[PDB]
Design a protein around this ligand. Structure first.
Ligand SMILES: C[C@H](CS)C(=O)NCB(O)O
Ligand SMILES: [Zn+2]
Ligand SMILES: [Zn+2]
Length: 231
């Protein structure tokens, strides 16, 4: 079974096999008086691993690297952060100290700096306008437009038809808006339309927080976002 928030002590990281060469990583962290679960992705990149997002903090990200070494045993050589919040970039300094080349869009890097968060080293090219996509090793990176944040990226693994939505996609059990401080609520439904348009064959859809599902999570997120807007 997919691990839930109450099953993971803060500081421990679980790995979950989604498909051949594709894992999610699951961690937990305290934020504003509560503890939340958080997902990222790991994709085999030949003899190396590509990491999508940190495990939300330095200590968690160190635990992530240790679990990867124990369970998978290939080196993480590159990481992509899919937006500027600490559940995506917190731990980039640990990754860099471990030899990982860290990447994000120029916008994510600037937004992280203003927020006082850690800053991925390298700028991704070609992701500036809504609908832009670039190949990055075994994945495609897609900028769907503003949603959960203005800079949020999604990631597709063609080999396995896995769509990693990050925090622009909600799990099915979430029925109220999450952290929308940095969101563009008016654009978010259209950005989800762009994801659906680009990845209609997705078989597994991974939200930034909580349980994976299928493309039903896209319509579900749109419903939650719109209802919050009508409040
Ligand atoms: C820090 C992280 C950025 S997306 C967050 O807001 N977690 C709480 B959530 O509602 O899951
Ligand atoms: Zn966020
Ligand atoms: Zn998040």
């Amino acid at each position: 079974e997919y691990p839930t928030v109450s099953e993971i002590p803060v500081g421990e990281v679980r790995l979950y096999q989604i498909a051949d060469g594709v894992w999610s990583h699951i961690a937990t962290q305290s934020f504003d008086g509560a503890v939340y679960p958080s997902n990222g992705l790991i994709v085999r990149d030949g003899d190396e691993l590509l990491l999508i997002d940190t495990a939300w903090g330095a200590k968690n990200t160190a635990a992530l690297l240790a679990e990867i070494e124990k369970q998978i045993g290939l080196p993480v050589t590159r990481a992509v952060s899919t937006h500027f919040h600490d559940d995506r970039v917190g731990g980039v300094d640990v990754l860099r100290a471990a030899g990982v080349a860290t990447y994000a869009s120029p916008s994510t890097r600037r937004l992280a700096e203003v927020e006082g968060n850690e800053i991925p080293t390298h700028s991704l090219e070609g992701l500036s306008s809504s609908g832009d996509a670039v190949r990055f090793g075994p994945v495609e990176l897609f900028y769907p437009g503003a949603a959960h944040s203005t800079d949020n990226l999604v990631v597709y693994v063609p080999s396995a038809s896995v769509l990693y939505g990050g925090c622009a996609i909600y799990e099915l059990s979430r029925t109220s808006a999450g952290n929308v401080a940095d969101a563009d609520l008016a654009e978010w439904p259209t950005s989800i339309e762009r994801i659906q348009q680009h990845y209609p064959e997705a078989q597994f859809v991974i939200p930034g927080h909580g349980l994976p599902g299928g493309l039903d999570l896209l319509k579900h997120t749109t419903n939650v976002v719109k209802a919050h807007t009508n409040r």
